């Protein structure tokens, strides 16, 4: 995964979304980079650097942590996505950036990042359609299930939006997020999603490598079976 000179294909994007691990230093009691390394070894197909909150790293310490996480992704051959921070994504030559409804406007971000991967968090049909129009390569829909990892989230929606989007003929790459575990991931894929994203199911697992491997194995099975 080098510098992109063309927009990523939908086929490739959907493959990358399979097991999308997201993490910040304040999401685990273990060593942050070590957990990321274990998740990648287990089978995570994409990683998002999400460092925010009161006890998250800032300044130079945050940048250095990001560099080490990006290096871990490079060693595993997995793309590195930055959450919220467009400047950081450009400065590190990240593979992509993820933004939400309260962040920089998607039109503005797409113009600033060229052909880098762009993900947009959506909670309604209107937002999903707007994201596609603005040039997003994928949308993150949720929260599917209850979650305490992110407090300022909108109402839990199950797989309702995923189903509605596919029903309207929209084929944009979709990843589900919010309280997803190895036990409840199947319905997300069966509803039409191209993958599942998670923080705590892997970051707080007593065995992150095994947890990631389990996710990878079952998601592959579900995608072939739906
Ligand atoms: C970042 C984010 N965005 C919507 S829900 C969520 C949290 C996912 O965390 P967990 O997988 O631990 O529920
Ligand atoms: C709020 C979010 C929603 N979706 C995603 C992703 F999984 F990447 F799509 N990441 C986020 N940080
Ligand atoms: Mg955001």
Coordinates of C-alpha atoms and ligand atoms in Angstrom, one line a residue:
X1 CA 0.0 0.0 0.0
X2 CA 1.9 3.0 -1.3
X3 CA 0.9 6.5 -2.4
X4 CA -2.4 6.2 -4.3
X5 CA -2.7 7.9 -7.7
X6 CA -6.3 6.7 -8.2
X7 CA -9.4 6.3 -6.0
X8 CA -9.5 2.9 -4.3
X9 CA -11.8 0.4 -6.1
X10 CA -14.9 -0.7 -4.3
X11 CA -13.8 -4.3 -4.5
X12 CA -10.6 -3.6 -2.7
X13 CA -12.2 -1.3 -0.1
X14 CA -14.8 -3.9 0.8
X15 CA -12.0 -6.5 1.4
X16 CA -10.2 -4.1 3.7
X17 CA -13.2 -3.5 5.8
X18 CA -13.5 -7.1 6.9
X19 CA -12.0 -6.8 10.4
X20 CA -11.4 -3.1 11.0
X21 CA -9.6 -2.6 14.3
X22 CA -9.8 0.9 15.9
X23 CA -7.7 1.9 18.9
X24 CA -6.1 4.6 21.0
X25 CA -3.8 4.4 24.1
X26 CA -6.7 4.9 26.4
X27 CA -8.7 1.9 25.2
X28 CA -6.4 -0.8 26.8
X29 CA -4.6 -1.4 30.0
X30 CA -1.8 -3.2 28.1
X31 CA 1.0 -1.6 26.1
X32 CA -0.8 0.2 23.2
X33 CA 1.6 -0.6 20.3
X34 CA 1.9 -4.2 21.5
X35 CA -1.9 -4.6 21.3
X36 CA -2.0 -3.2 17.8
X37 CA 0.8 -5.6 16.8
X38 CA -1.1 -8.5 18.2
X39 CA -4.3 -7.5 16.5
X40 CA -2.5 -7.3 13.1
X41 CA -0.8 -10.6 13.7
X42 CA -4.2 -12.2 14.4
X43 CA -5.8 -11.0 11.2
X44 CA -7.1 -7.4 11.4
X45 CA -7.5 -6.1 7.8
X46 CA -7.5 -2.4 8.5
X47 CA -6.5 -0.2 11.4
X48 CA -7.7 3.2 12.6
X49 CA -5.5 5.5 14.8
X50 CA -8.1 7.0 17.2
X51 CA -6.5 9.0 20.0
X52 CA -8.9 11.3 21.8
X53 CA -10.4 12.0 25.2
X54 CA -9.2 13.5 28.4
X55 CA -6.5 10.9 29.1
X56 CA -5.3 10.5 25.5
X57 CA -1.8 11.5 24.4
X58 CA -1.3 14.9 22.8
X59 CA 1.5 16.9 21.2
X60 CA 4.8 15.2 20.2
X61 CA 3.9 12.1 22.3
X62 CA 0.8 11.6 20.2
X63 CA 2.7 11.9 16.9
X64 CA 5.4 9.5 18.1
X65 CA 2.8 6.9 19.1
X66 CA 1.1 7.4 15.7
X67 CA 4.4 6.7 13.9
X68 CA 5.0 3.5 15.8
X69 CA 1.4 2.3 15.1
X70 CA 1.9 3.2 11.4
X71 CA 5.2 1.2 11.4
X72 CA 3.4 -1.8 12.8
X73 CA 0.8 -1.6 10.1
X74 CA 3.5 -1.4 7.4
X75 CA 5.2 -4.5 8.8
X76 CA 1.9 -6.4 8.6
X77 CA 1.0 -5.0 5.2
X78 CA -2.2 -3.4 6.5
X79 CA -3.5 0.1 5.7
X80 CA -3.2 2.8 8.4
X81 CA -6.2 5.2 8.8
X82 CA -6.2 8.4 10.9
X83 CA -9.4 9.5 12.8
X84 CA -10.5 13.2 12.7
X85 CA -7.0 14.7 12.2
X86 CA -6.6 15.6 8.5
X87 CA -3.2 17.4 9.1
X88 CA -1.8 14.3 10.9
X89 CA -3.0 12.0 8.1
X90 CA -1.2 14.2 5.5
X91 CA 2.0 14.6 7.6
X92 CA 2.4 10.9 8.2
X93 CA 1.4 9.9 4.7
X94 CA -1.4 7.8 6.2
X95 CA -3.4 5.6 3.8
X96 CA -6.7 7.3 4.8
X97 CA -8.7 9.4 7.1
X98 CA -12.0 8.9 8.9
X99 CA -14.4 11.7 9.8
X100 CA -17.8 12.1 11.5
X101 CA -20.8 14.4 11.2
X102 CA -19.2 17.0 13.6
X103 CA -15.8 17.0 12.0
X104 CA -14.5 18.7 8.8
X105 CA -16.9 18.6 5.9
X106 CA -16.3 15.6 3.6
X107 CA -16.2 17.8 0.5
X108 CA -13.4 19.9 2.1
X109 CA -11.5 16.7 3.3
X110 CA -11.7 14.9 -0.1
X111 CA -10.2 18.0 -1.7
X112 CA -7.3 18.1 0.7
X113 CA -6.3 14.4 0.6
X114 CA -6.3 13.6 -3.1
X115 CA -6.9 9.9 -3.7
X116 CA -6.4 8.8 -0.1
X117 CA -9.1 6.6 1.5
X118 CA -11.9 8.6 3.0
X119 CA -14.4 7.1 5.5
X120 CA -17.4 8.9 6.9
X121 CA -19.5 8.0 9.9
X122 CA -23.3 8.0 9.1
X123 CA -26.4 7.4 11.2
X124 CA -29.2 8.2 8.8
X125 CA -30.0 7.6 5.1
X126 CA -29.6 11.3 4.4
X127 CA -26.1 11.3 5.8
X128 CA -25.2 8.1 3.9
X129 CA -26.3 9.6 0.6
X130 CA -24.5 12.9 1.4
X131 CA -21.2 11.0 2.2
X132 CA -21.4 9.2 -1.2
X133 CA -22.0 12.4 -3.0
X134 CA -19.1 14.1 -1.2
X135 CA -16.7 11.4 -2.3
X136 CA -16.4 9.0 0.6
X137 CA -14.9 5.6 -0.2
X138 CA -16.8 3.9 2.7
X139 CA -19.3 4.7 5.5
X140 CA -19.3 3.5 9.1
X141 CA -22.8 2.8 10.3
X142 CA -23.9 2.5 13.9
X143 CA -24.0 2.2 16.7
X144 CA -25.2 -1.3 15.9
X145 CA -25.2 -2.4 19.6
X146 CA -24.8 -0.6 22.9
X147 CA -21.3 0.8 23.6
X148 CA -19.6 2.7 26.4
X149 CA -16.3 3.1 24.6
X150 CA -17.6 6.2 22.8
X151 CA -20.1 8.1 25.1
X152 CA -21.4 10.8 22.7
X153 CA -23.1 8.4 20.3
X154 CA -26.5 8.5 18.7
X155 CA -29.2 6.0 19.4
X156 CA -28.5 2.3 18.9
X157 CA -29.9 1.1 15.5
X158 CA -29.1 -2.5 15.1
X159 CA -28.7 -3.5 11.4
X160 CA -31.7 -1.4 10.3
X161 CA -29.7 1.2 8.4
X162 CA -27.4 -1.3 6.7
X163 CA -30.5 -3.2 5.4
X164 CA -32.2 0.0 4.3
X165 CA -29.2 1.2 2.4
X166 CA -28.9 -2.0 0.4
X167 CA -32.6 -1.9 -0.2
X168 CA -32.3 1.4 -1.9
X169 CA -29.7 0.0 -4.3
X170 CA -26.7 1.7 -2.7
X171 CA -23.5 -0.3 -3.1
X172 CA -21.1 1.9 -1.3
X173 CA -18.7 0.0 1.0
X174 CA -20.2 -0.3 4.5
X175 CA -18.7 -1.3 7.9
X176 CA -20.7 -1.7 11.0
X177 CA -19.6 -0.3 14.4
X178 CA -20.7 -0.2 18.0
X179 CA -20.5 -3.0 20.6
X180 CA -19.5 -5.6 18.1
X181 CA -18.1 -8.9 19.5
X182 CA -17.3 -12.3 18.0
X183 CA -20.8 -13.4 19.2
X184 CA -22.9 -10.8 17.4
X185 CA -20.9 -10.0 14.3
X186 CA -22.6 -12.4 11.9
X187 CA -25.9 -10.4 11.6
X188 CA -23.9 -7.3 10.6
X189 CA -22.5 -9.1 7.6
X190 CA -25.8 -10.9 6.8
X191 CA -27.5 -7.5 6.7
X192 CA -25.2 -6.4 3.8
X193 CA -22.2 -4.9 5.5
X194 CA -18.7 -5.5 4.1
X195 CA -17.1 -5.9 7.5
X196 CA -17.2 -5.1 11.2
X197 CA -15.2 -2.6 13.2
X198 CA -14.4 -2.8 16.9
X199 CA -12.3 -1.3 19.7
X200 CA -12.9 -3.1 23.0
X201 CA -13.6 -6.6 21.8
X202 CA -10.0 -6.8 20.7
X203 CA -8.2 -4.0 22.7
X204 CA -9.5 -5.3 26.0
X205 CA -9.3 -9.0 25.2
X206 CA -7.1 -11.2 27.4
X207 CA -5.8 -12.5 24.1
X208 CA -6.0 -9.8 21.4
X209 CA -4.2 -12.0 18.7
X210 CA -6.7 -14.8 19.2
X211 CA -9.6 -12.4 19.2
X212 CA -8.6 -10.9 15.9
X213 CA -8.0 -14.3 14.4
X214 CA -11.5 -15.4 15.5
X215 CA -13.0 -12.3 13.9
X216 CA -11.0 -12.9 10.6
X217 CA -12.1 -16.5 10.4
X218 CA -15.8 -16.0 11.0
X219 CA -16.2 -12.8 8.9
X220 CA -14.7 -14.7 5.9
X221 CA -17.2 -17.4 6.5
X222 CA -20.1 -15.0 6.7
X223 CA -19.2 -13.1 3.6
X224 CA -19.0 -16.3 1.5
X225 CA -22.3 -17.4 3.0
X226 CA -24.3 -14.2 2.2
Ligands
LIG1 C1 -15.7 4.9 17.7 C2 -17.2 4.5 17.7 N1 -18.0 5.1 16.9 C3 -19.3 4.7 17.0 S1 -19.5 3.6 18.2 C4 -17.8 3.6 18.5 C5 -17.1 2.8 19.5 C6 -16.7 1.4 19.2 O1 -16.1 0.8 20.4 P1 -16.5 -0.6 20.8 O2 -16.1 -1.6 19.6 O3 -15.7 -0.9 22.0 O4 -18.0 -0.6 21.1
LIG2 C1 -17.4 7.0 14.8 C2 -16.8 6.0 13.8 C3 -17.6 5.3 13.0 N1 -17.2 4.4 12.1 C4 -15.8 4.2 12.0 C5 -15.4 3.2 11.0 F1 -15.4 2.0 11.5 F2 -14.1 3.4 10.7 F3 -16.1 3.2 10.0 N2 -14.9 4.8 12.8 C6 -15.4 5.7 13.7 N3 -14.4 6.3 14.4
LIG3 MG1 -14.8 12.2 14.6

